[PDB]
Amino acid sequence: GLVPRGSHEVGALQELVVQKGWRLPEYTVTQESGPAHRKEFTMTCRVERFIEIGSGTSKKLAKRNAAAKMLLRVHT
Template identity: 45%
Template structure:
């Protein structure tokens, strides 16, 4: 069987995990990557999404988690590529994929520089919150950061409710909470949902 030509990853380091994995599937004829939302939990302003990713030819399935559907999709794509590489490193095989193709695939992934030595913590860890996720999203894709402002408060001084807006370009969302931080996270979560809807 002829060896698969590596070629050059097309600026993969600037791409998302989903686009890199799509390119990998196309280049190595792994077939279609099937993403399915399997769970959605939490309040409307602070949901967690669980996305299943299956590639029949590889015979493996992974689940990604995120604060948005798109984030869960990226997490799943990363985990799938990570699993492919770890299977190769362990000397294993993937379904009917010839070893030579698996070797070429992993060499291509290394050239991409997409994968780290371990899987990052899920974005739902307490260290990450919607405001943090939104800031990270803006830093990687936009030239401006979200602008947060307390627009009003209500309730007695010992039990205030804060209302905060999040402005990003011409998009504006509002969140409320028992602290400024909570209100900020609610507003950021709503903004992430808008951005996700625009991407899908």
Template identity: 40%
Template sequence: MGKLLNIKSVRKETDSIAYVFVDGKFIASASAAKKDLAKLEAAKIALDTLAPLLPPTSMRPSITDMQLRAKQKLNELCQNKKWPKPEYSIAEESGPAHGKRFVCSVKITIEEEEGGFLLRNGCEKSKLKDAENSAASMMLRTLLLP
């Protein structure tokens, strides 16, 4: 099963401070003038902190079927667990108009009343649909792999 991610924010004078917790353990914090920016920065710092703890790609099992229909499988998983539908957004967009590249993120709310959610970015892709599928695949890996 995946980890429970919780981002809490507080307002201090003119700044918002966001704190990232994974399974109740403090991982990172960041501050910014706007709450959403503080949360985003704290999440980026948390990902940078946690990335070295992941096993090398060569040690992870191949999940080709999961990668092919990841969005569909993630929707089914959320439905089975009675979670809201996954929310996809563009995390990064780069390149000229004729050669756009996208990185998408997917967010799953786990505990609505407490603000707990899981957030994963996918890999950069040339098609938005493929970028969303990549994010869904990463989320499935988080949820299903030990």
């Protein structure tokens, strides 16, 4: 849904996992639905033992929502 205004989800996760001594997350598009004029995307984020998904009206939004979810997973 929403990421905090002016926060950098993908870069923050990348920087966090580097400091935990983990390899960089892997992002893959794992779903696309709807017509070409109202598309929705799902990105999967994988790092260490975790797998979290994010979705959005664009791939960039989907990926940012995937990173946010992963940040929540790793920090909690």
